[PDB]
Amino acid sequence: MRIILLGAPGAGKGTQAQFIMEKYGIPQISTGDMLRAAVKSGSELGKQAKDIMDAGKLVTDELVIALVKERIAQEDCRNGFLLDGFPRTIPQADAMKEAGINVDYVLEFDVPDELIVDRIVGRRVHAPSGRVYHVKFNPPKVEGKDDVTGEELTTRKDDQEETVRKRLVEWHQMTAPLIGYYSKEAEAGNTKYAKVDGTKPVAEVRADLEKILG
Ligand SMILES: Nc1ncnc2c1ncn2[C@@H]1O[C@H](COP(=O)(O)OP(=O)(O)OP(=O)(O)OP(=O)(O)OP(=O)(O)OC[C@H]2O[C@@H](n3cnc4c(N)ncnc43)[C@H](O)[C@@H]2O)[C@@H](O)[C@H]1O
Ligand SMILES: [Mg+2]
Ligand code: NA
C-alpha cells in the first residue's frame, strides 16, 4: 500500500503515521525527519536545509525529490510506503507522476489555523525514530522520555511561534493546491482521497484512519 499524508503544520500527520506504519507494515517517509537527520549528521545530501528550515521556508524541490528517490529505493519500500510531508508542492507531485509512482490513498488532515501554534510550541520529539509527543495534549508516559526507548526527548529548533506562522503561510501558498491536485486524481480513479478531522483525540483520529484504510 502507498499513502500520502497531506495537511497543514501540526495537523497530526507524524503522530498518525506511527500507527499506519505498524498496522500495514510500511515505512514512514518523513521529509522533515530526513532533512533534520541530514543536518544533524552533516550529510552532503540534505545538510543545506539547515538555514532554510530555520527561516520556516520550504527546501528546494530538487533537494527533497532526491532524498525521497534515494529513500524509497531501499528494500524496506518494495512493498509499499507512507509519504509523510511529501509531496509539498505541485512540482514534487508531478515528479512522482513522471517517475510512475502510483498511490492508493491521499489522506488530508484538517485542523483550524488557530490550533496550530499551541500544538507546535508544546511538541517534543524522539529524533532517532521520529516519534512525536505534546506536553499537554499527548504527553509521554514519563516526562521528557521516549515511551519506546526511554531516551531523552528534544525540542525542534524551528518550533517557535514565529517560525510556525511562516510555515503556515508557506502551506497555504504552496501546498494547499495539492488538495485539488489529488482530489482530481481521485476522480480519475488514480487514487482514493479522504479528509479527516484532526481535532479529535489521537485515538479517534487513528480509528477514523483505520476505517478508511480498511
Ligand atoms: N517536501 C518538503 N519539501 C520542501 N521542504 C520540506 C519538505 N518537508 C520538510 N521540509 C522542510 O522541513 C521543515 C519542517 O517541516 P515538517 O517537518 O513537515 O514540520 P511541520 O511543518 O511543523 O509540520 P509536521 O508535518 O511536522 O506536523 P504534523 O502534521 O506531523 O503534526 P504532528 O503529528 O507533529 O502533531 C503536532 C503536535 O500536536 C500533537 N498532536 C498530534 N495529534 C494530536 C491530536 N489528535 N490531538 C491533540 N494533539 C495532537 C502532537 O503530539 C504534536 O506535538 C519545512 O519547513 C521545510 O523547510
Ligand atoms: Mg509529519
Ligand atoms: Na492508484
Author numbering: 1 to 214
Give verbatim excerpts from the published study on this entry.
AdK catalysis, which plays a vital role in cellular energy homeostasis by catalysing the reversible magnesium-dependent formation of ADP from AMP and ATP10, is dependent on distinct ATP- and AMP-binding subdomains (ATPlid and AMPbd). The turnover rate of AdK is limited by product release, and it has been shown that the microscopic step accountable for this slow release is the re-opening of the substrate-binding subdomains. AdK populates two main structural ground states: an open substrate-free state and a closed Ap5a-bound state. The ground state structures of the P177A and Y171W variants in their apo- and Ap5a-bound states were determined by X-ray crystallography.
The Tyr171 to Trp (Y171W) mutation was selected because it was anticipated that this mutation would modulate the enzyme's dynamics and facilitate stopped-flow measurements of the enzyme's ligand binding kinetics. P1,P5-di(adenosine-5′)pentaphosphate (Ap5a) consists of one ATP and one AMP molecule bridged by a phosphoryl group, and is a good structural mimic of the enzyme's two native substrates. Notably, the electron density of Trp171 shows that the side-chain samples two rotamer conformations in the Ap5a-bound state, and the wild-type Y171 conformation is partially overlapping both of these Trp171 rotamers. In sharp contrast, the 1H–15N heteronuclear single quantum coherence (HSQC) NMR spectrum of Y171W bound to Ap5a shows two sets of resonances at ambient temperature: 61 of its residues give rise to two peaks of roughly equal intensity. These 61 residues are distributed over the entire enzyme, showing that the underlying event is global in nature, and not restricted to the side-chain atoms of Trp171 as seen in the crystal structure. Since we observe two sets of resonances in the NMR spectrum of Ap5a-bound Y171W and its diffusion coefficient is equal to the average of those for the open and closed states of the wild type, we assigned the split peaks in its NMR spectrum to two distinct structural states—an Ap5a-bound open conformation and an Ap5a-bound closed conformation. In the crystal structure of Ap5a-bound Y171W, the enzyme is fully closed, whereas NMR measurements show that Ap5a-bound Y171W exchanges between open and closed states in solution. Hence, it appears that one of the side-chain conformations observed in the crystal structure triggers opening of the enzyme in solution. In this particular case, the altered dynamics likely depend on the two different side-chain conformations of Y171W in the Ap5a-bound state. Overall, it appears that the Y171W mutation shifts the dynamic response of AdK into a regime where fluctuations in the Ap5a-bound state become slow on the NMR timescale and hence directly observable.
